[PDB]
Design a protein around this ligand. Structure first.
Ligand code: HEM
Ligand SMILES: Cc1c(C)c2c(c(C)c1O)CC[C@](C)(COc1ccc(C[C@H]3SC(=O)NC3=O)cc1)O2
Ligand SMILES: CCCCCCCCCCCCCCCC(=O)O
Length: 464
């Protein structure tokens, strides 16, 4: 007995009842008719949707174990093969994530903290923006390089030089597989697999890129193997290799060259375009909101000064900027529908039974936009994370990284990259818009699984 829901048409479920261009709007509308929990069918597939804090929490958190399964999909399986962390489940998942989480702690991979890799990058970033000579530009590409390089310096050792050819194709490929796989069409194709045949070129293009990336990562892992100094790991690959060596006698062990290549790939996928997007969105919101960028730069000046690059320890003494980064994430609403889950076994939810394997969808956006927890949930306002005395006010409704057992495996890095990149930038540049601010649109183009900020141009004017 699944939760209530629209009546499905025998073969295509409720597909033609939901706008694939903005399926979140469709879901919100269904909740107005069926309530917090409801079932909809994408083709033959039943998807139970959780909408609102009470429901999302009850599911993701209170029943975390049952809801910690990754929502399967033909396209994910063909590419990842159940390998790595993003698309794995059960034991293999539990083990890889557990290892990943620890080797991604600030000092979980050697003498060089992750924070220091981010700072080196935040630095190279401003020196690039510096090169645009205050002229108007589309930050998209340049902003996307930073997050990509962070991941590079987290898994491969040192960062790449922005001009490095290897770095640029390794990036244009992820950016390519991203622009393709984030199309509403993939959602359709995932439920009606036959449709993939209607896209031979695109199909080949993806697998082609997945080939080149994987084989490249594999080249790197051999490099890391030849130079492996077990006493002091340089990066994610050294740590994983070290771990392999230990489980060596075990042929059950998930830690093998297979999961390694996948997990590194997963890291690029899971941490590049997301961060990049929130970054662009963030700069855009700061551009549109001059009064906010000002207090941030005032806080930066008052705590960090003009003779020292910001660091994570400062965030503790910068409640406003903290509220700003949280509001940026709360407004960006990067993944409105959250990433699909799947219950691990027959699961009881209130007066409903959800059969093992059923696909779950916890509407993060419904949390992030709770009109009671965040009055005027649709306006960008740091006050949403600020108390009467200007102190940061954490919220339970802050779920942009999801929640429960499967919450973003890189929340820390994500938040770190956002705080260091944004501050390091505002400390060195002022944001000027090409046109009149009123003409500046900040409404997201919520097509596909990841929302994107509208396109825009910006001038980075170095400060004096
Ligand atoms: C501002 C940027 C980012 C946001 C908003 C974000 C958020 C998310 C979300 C919503 C999920 C899905 C959670 C779920 O299963 O319900 C996720 C998963 C994941 N994220 Fe991120 N992410 C970002 C950056 C990062 C970064 C920088 C890394 C890299 C270390 C990363 C690594 C992962 C991984 C590995 C998973 C899969 C975890 C699993 O399946 O157990 N993320 N993230
Ligand atoms: C590069 C990139 C991709 C391709 C991306 C997403 C992000 C955030 C990315 O940075 C979000 C999900 C989605 C838009 C669609 O769902 C998928 C998520 C991950 C994957 C992993 C595949 S894509 C790739 O180049 N290598 C992989 O292992 C496939 C599909 O894919
Ligand atoms: C194993 C990988 C399989 C990948 C299959 C991808 C199938 C969906 C391809 C969708 C392509 C959409 C192209 C048009 C995009 C647009 O113009 O908006």
């Amino acid at each position: 007995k699944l939760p209530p829901g629209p009546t499905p048409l025998p073969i295509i479920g409720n597909m033609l009842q939901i706008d694939v261009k903005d399926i979140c709007k469709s879901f919100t509308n269904f909740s107005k008719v069926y309530g917090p929990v409801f079932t909809v069918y994408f083709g033959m597939n039943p998807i139970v949707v959780f909408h609102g804090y009470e429901a999302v929490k009850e599911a993701l958190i209170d029943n975390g174990e049952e809801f910690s399964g990754r929502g399967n999909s033909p396209i994910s399986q063909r590419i990842t093969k159940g390998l790595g962390i993003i698309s794995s489940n059960g034991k293999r998942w539990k083990e890889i994530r557990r290892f990943s989480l620890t080797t991604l702690r600030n000092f979980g991979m050697g003498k060089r903290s992750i924070e220091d890799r981010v700072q080196e990058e935040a630095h190279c970033l401003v020196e690039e923006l510096r090169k645009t000579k205050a002229s108007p530009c589309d930050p998209t590409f340049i902003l996307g390089c930073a997050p990509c390089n962070v991941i590079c310096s987290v898994v491969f050792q040192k960062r790449f030089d922005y001009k490095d050819q290897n770095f640029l194709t390794l990036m244009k490929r992820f950016n390519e597989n991203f622009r393709i796989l984030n199309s509403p069409w993939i959602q359709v194709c995932n439920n009606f697999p036959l449709l993939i045949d209607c896209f031979p070129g695109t199909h080949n293009k993806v697998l082609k890129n997945v080939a080149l990336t994987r084989s490249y990562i594999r080249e790197k892992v051999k490099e890391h193997q030849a130079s492996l100094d077990v006493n002091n790991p340089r990066d994610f690959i050294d740590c994983f290799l070290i771990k392999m060596e230990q489980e060596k006698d075990n042929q059950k062990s998930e830690f093998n060259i297979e999961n390694l290549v996948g997990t590194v790939a997963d890291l690029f996928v899971a941490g590049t375009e997301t961060t990049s997007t929130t970054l662009r969105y963030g700069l855009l919101l700061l551009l549109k909101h001059p009064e906010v960028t000002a207090k941030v730069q005032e806080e930066i000046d008052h705590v960090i000064g003009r003779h020292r690059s910001p660091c994570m320890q400062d965030r503790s003494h910068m409640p406003y900027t903290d509220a700003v980064v949280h509001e940026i994430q709360r407004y960006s609403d990067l993944v409105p529908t959250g990433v699909p889950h799947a219950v691990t076994t027959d699961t009881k939810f209130r007066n409903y039974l959800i059969p093992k394997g059923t696909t779950i969808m916890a509407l993060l956006t419904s949390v992030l936009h709770d009109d009671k927890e965040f009055p005027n949930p649709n306006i960008f306002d740091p006050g949403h994370f600020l108390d009467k005395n200007g102190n940061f006010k954490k919220s339970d409704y802050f779920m942009p990284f999801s929640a429960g057992k499967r919450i973003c495996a890189g929340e820390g890095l994500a938040r770190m990259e956002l705080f260091l990149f944004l501050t390091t930038i505002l400390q060195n540049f002022n944001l000027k818009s090409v046109d009149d601010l009123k003409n500046l649109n900040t409404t997201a183009v919520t097509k596909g699984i990841v929302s994107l900020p509208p396109s825009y141009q910006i001038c980075f004017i170095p400060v004096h």
